[PDB]
Amino acid sequence: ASVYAWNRKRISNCVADYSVLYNSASFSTFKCYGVSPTKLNDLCFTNVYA
């Protein structure tokens, strides 16, 4: 999507293997505020919005 019309995807009722993301070499910026993606593996959430 264009930035002015940024898309939002709701993630729910699923297992989130965050490793696939934070072990990948495909990203040049990967910056998490207030959380560690490794610890996300041990947490459950009610709202996730990519």
């Binding site: 207030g34 959380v35 560690s36 490794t38 610890k39 041990d42 947490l43």
Partner: protein, 49 residues
């Protein structure tokens, strides 16, 4: 009310403790007043802050 002088003491002490305990629910600027939540969400570098 005759024994108010004693009751006062009791109440005062109680109030103190209550406030003390309720002060455990404050953030003081942290992202969460629960130590275990901070530890469950942050690694040492900023969890320590």
């Amino acid at each position: 009310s005759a024994l108010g002088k004693l009751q006062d003491v009791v109440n005062q002490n109680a109030q103190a403790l209550n406030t003390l305990v309720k002060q455990l629910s404050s953030n003081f600027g942290a992202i969460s007043s629960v130590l275990n939540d901070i530890l469950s969400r942050l690694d040492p570098p900023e969890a320590e802050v």
